[PDB]
Amino acid sequence: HMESADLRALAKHLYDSYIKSFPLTKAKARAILTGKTTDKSPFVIYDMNSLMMGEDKIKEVAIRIFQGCQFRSVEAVQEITEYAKSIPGFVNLDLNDQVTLLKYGVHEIIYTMLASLMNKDGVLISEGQGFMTREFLKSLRKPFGDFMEPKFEFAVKFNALELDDSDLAIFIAVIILSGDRPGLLNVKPIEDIQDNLLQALELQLKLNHPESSQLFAKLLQKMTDLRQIVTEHVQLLQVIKKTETDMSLHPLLQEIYKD
């Protein structure tokens, strides 16, 4: 449908907007995680006392961490929404469909971009100023410990693809413009956009990872991992809500999960 130079033009547009919309890119996250730098070193939270000193440097503990995750997730939804509006064609769609695409897309994107902040040992927090260990997260009390770990399980697998931000920008766009979301009114204009986004992703991956055979297909197979984990996540929230009333969700998240 589109010519090669237009596909490169679209990749560059989406990368540029991705940089403008998201505060902490994978490039910066990797520089902090690998280290070698004295200025970008995070403070590491691995236990209670280090959590106590960290809140000085940058309610029950598992709740406080959980609320920390909701708060950043809500911020992520805002950033994702701002990015979505820059995807060519998105704002021109029926307004109910705009809501529907975001409703079902934000969680799959949050998981994707969370991986950029992760390695096998923990996750960056507070715009990269802190690093909270995986083992500490998994050791939180009964419901919450195992609520944290699946995010890491996805991230190590997804990060083995070695995508960079310019790849992720198009991949994220492809997720949003999914015509198979429930309740869409005009699937066809959404698929026309995804077709160009898919063409753009395909060419991008061929040029940026010429040695990574069938990375396109392998990356699309990860969209399978994203559906299931989002589903598990929702089922865990419902269970936690049924026990914890010292918890309450941001109305933005509340609406997303309803029906």
Ligand X SMILES: O=C(O)c1ccc(-c2nn(C(=O)c3c(Cl)cccc3Cl)c3ccc(Cl)cc23)c(OCc2ccccc2)c1
Q: How far apart are CA 228 and CA 167, in angstroms?
A: 22
Give the one entry of ligand X, its own copies, none that residue 1 binds, where binding means its C-beta sits below a cut-off of 5 to 8 angstroms depending on kind: its own copies
- Contact between 31 and ligand X (CB under 6 A)? no
Residue 33 touches which member of ligand X, its own copies, none, C-beta under 5-8 Å by kind: none
- How many Å apart are CA 104 and CA 192, to the nearest integer? 19
CB 150 within 8 Å of CB 76: no
In the complex, the smallest distance separating the C-beta of residue 104 from ligand X, rounded to whole angstroms, is 12
- Extract the annotated binding site for rosiglitazone: 70-73, 107, 233, 257
Q: In the complex with ligand X, which residue's Cβ is closer, 2 or 19?
A: 19
**Near ligand X in 55-94, by CB under 6 A:** 65, 68-70, 72-73, 76
| Cβ atoms of 23 and 79 closer than 8 Å | yes
Q: Contact letters (x/-) for ligand X, 120-159, by CB under 6 A?
A: ---x-x------x----x----------x--x--------
Q: Quote the CA–CA distance of 221 and 99 in Å, as a whole number.
A: 25
Q: Does 113 bind ligand X (CB under 6 A)?
A: yes
CA 17, CA 24: separation in Å to the nearest integer? 13
Q: In the block, which residue shows the tokens 């990375």?
A: 215
How far apart are the C-alpha atoms of 118 and 159, rounded to whole Å? 8
**Residue keyed to tokens 């547009």:** 13
Cβ proximity to ligand X: between 68 and 183 the closer is: 68
Residues near ligand X, by CB under 6 A: 65, 68-70, 72-73, 76, 107, 110-111, 113-114, 117, 123, 125, 132, 137, 148, 151, 253
